[PDB]
Amino acid sequence: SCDTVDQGYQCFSETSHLWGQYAPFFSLANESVISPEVPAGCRVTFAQVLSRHGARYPTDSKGKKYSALIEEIQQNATTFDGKYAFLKTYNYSLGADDLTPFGEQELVNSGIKFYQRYESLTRNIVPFIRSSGSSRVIASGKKFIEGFQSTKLKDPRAQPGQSSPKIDVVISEASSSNNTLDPGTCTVFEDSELADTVEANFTATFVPSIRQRLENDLSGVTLTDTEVTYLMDMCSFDTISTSTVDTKLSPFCDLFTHDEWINYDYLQSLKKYYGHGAGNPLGPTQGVGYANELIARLTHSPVHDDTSSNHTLDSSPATFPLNSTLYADFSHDNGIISILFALGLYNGTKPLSTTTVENITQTDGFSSAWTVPFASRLYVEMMQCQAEQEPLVRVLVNDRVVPLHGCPVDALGRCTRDSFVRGLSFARSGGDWAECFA
Ligand SMILES: *[C@@H]1O[C@H](CO)[C@@H](O)[C@H](O)[C@H]1NC(C)=O
Ligand SMILES: *[C@@H]1O[C@H](CO)[C@@H](O)[C@H](O)[C@H]1NC(C)=O
Numbered sequence: 001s002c003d004t005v006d007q008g009y010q011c012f013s014e015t016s017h018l019w020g021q022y023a024p025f026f027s028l029a030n031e032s033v034i035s036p037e038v039p040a041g042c043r044v045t046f047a048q049v050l051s052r053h054g055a056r057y058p059t060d061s062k063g064k065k066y067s068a069l070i071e072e073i074q075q076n077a078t079t080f081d082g083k084y085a086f087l088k089t090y091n092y093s094l095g096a097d098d099l100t101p102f103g104e105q106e107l108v109n110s111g112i113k114f115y116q117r118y119e120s121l122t123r124n125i126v127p128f129i130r131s132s133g134s135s136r137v138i139a140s141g142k143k144f145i146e147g148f149q150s151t152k153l154k155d156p157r158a159q160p161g162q163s164s165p166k167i168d169v170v171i172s173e174a175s176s177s178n179n180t181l182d183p184g185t186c187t188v189f190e191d192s193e194l195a196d197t198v199e200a201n202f203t204a205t206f207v208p209s210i211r212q213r214l215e216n217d218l219s220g221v222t223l224t225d226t227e228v229t230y231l232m233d234m235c236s237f238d239t240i241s242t243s244t245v246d247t248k249l250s251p252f253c254d255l256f257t258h259d260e261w262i263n264y265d266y267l268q269s270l271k272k273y274y275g276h277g278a279g280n281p282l283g284p285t286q287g288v289g290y291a292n293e294l295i296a297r298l299t300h301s302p303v304h305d306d307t308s309s310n311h312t313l314d315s316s317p318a319t320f321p322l323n324s325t326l327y328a329d330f331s332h333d334n335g336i337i338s339i340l341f342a343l344g345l346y347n348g349t350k351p352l353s354t355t356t357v358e359n360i361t362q363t364d365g366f367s368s369a370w371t372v373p374f375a376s377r378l379y380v381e382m383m384q385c386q387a388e389q390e391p392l393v394r395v396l397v398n399d400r401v402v403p404l405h406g407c408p409v410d411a412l413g414r415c416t417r418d419s420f421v422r423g424l425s426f427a428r429s430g431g432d433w434a435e436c437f438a
């Protein structure tokens with residue numbers, strides 16, 4: 001009941017919604033001031049979904065550190081009581097890198113939801129599908145296709161025995177690969193340390209108090225600030241790795257107060273903002289490949305790009321068809337942040353304060369949790385309306401209508417295609433990709 005196909009993960013939302021990019025997808029449809037519904041007189045003629053992979057186990061690296069930290073807490077501490085008792089016996093048995101059962105289901109759900117929302121097209125049109133080449137992203141693509149195909153089969157209006165939807169293109173994450181979904185070739189951006197600095201500066205403003213209380217409660221234990229954030233991370237990973245994802249919040253969660261979760265969440269928005277978003281000088285530049293691919297799709301014309309795009313892939317109709325109506329792309333949070341910013345979507349957002357928490361009003365809709373949670377989705381729609389000769393573009397971020405920037409937006413969040421594309425002059429010029437090397 002608190003976890004559904006349509007509304008996502010609304011369980012314990014006072015905690016679970018502040019885990020940033022470790023938050024399980026939760027729908028923001030009700031938080032949308034503008035209605036997500038197709039307006040009257042309007043028909044959707046195009047839909048692209050860009051999705052993150054689903055909930056996962058910790059990376060092997062982080063998982064070794066979590067697991068070693070907890071042993072140390074077990075070897076050293078003398079008092080494990082009250083909220084701390086569970087820690088004496090806690091037996092680290094999380095897996096590593098792979099999607100969890102819960103994460104698998106999120107993407108099945110996401111396929112169901114995309115199939116249903118665009119049913120008057122998904123009934124007879126097989127989406128053209130791409131995925132960044134990482135096992136968890138690929139597996140996610142296939143779970144999404146699973147749920148989509150299940151729903152098509154049950155739909156009385158679906159044209160049956162069409163080819164299956166499949167992952168048409170797996171884009172390489174190798175270091176030499178031009179990957180629009182998650183670029184790794186911008187040498188100077190790859191070397192950036194802005195995020196780390198910001199992370200440390202902000203963690204120093206709220207973590208030491210927590211560190212202190214933990215050392216106080218667990219006599220014999222001594223912790224770094226970084227270690228405290230590991231036990232904060234465990235609250236998400238120990239909640240959504242288990243069978244009890246829907247019924248029980250991890251015990252890690254209750255070692256920290258709501259106000260500390262607020263800082264945690266904000267910390268997570270900072271890492272993403274200065275790591276991959278407008279805060280980082282080459283962050284939005286990581287999104288221009290995809291933005292140029294998006295424009296080719298919207299205008300049914302050849303990709304004009306010389307940043308992250310692979311030309312062998314994009315100049316062939318087989319691996320980059322221009323008229324497929326429906327498209328699905330699967331990737332990582334960091335690439336999705338860059339793309340969100342390269343598309344102008346958060347150009348109402350002032351650079352985030354590195355010293356003080358900012359609520360979702362101050363940041364004008366930007367947060368890690370609101371943009372790239374586990375199984376995040378972005379939908380780009382093109383629609384044709386009664387009073388207008390031109391197609392109108394509309395964008396939703398996790399079910400929230402996000403008003404376009406760079407073009408004359410109407411009160412429904414939309415701009416004409418031609419003006420939206422013209423607005424994307426930063427991506428059209430290649431953004432700051434020339435600086436990847438000087
Ligand atoms: C572009 O894609 C092709 C086809 O998958 C591949 O073999 C080649 O490595 C890619 N080139 C770059 C620069 O990514
Ligand atoms: C546990 O004690 C060891 C050895 O004294 C020390 O080096 C380590 O930092 C302590 N760790 C924690 C998490 O308290």
Ligand SMILES: *[C@@H]1O[C@H](CO)[C@@H](O)[C@H](O)[C@H]1NC(C)=O
Binds near residue numbers: 308310312
């Ligand atoms: C890959 O991107 C680089 C850097 O933008 C570009 O110059 C090169 O020609 C591209 N290679 C392919 C196969 O698209």
Ligand SMILES: *[C@@H]1O[C@H](CO)[C@@H](O)[C@H](O)[C@H]1NC(C)=O
Binds near residue numbers: 343344405426
């Ligand atoms: C968004 O603002 C950035 C901030 O520099 C600018 O480069 C970009 O062109 C703007 N994009 C749109 C669509 O307005």
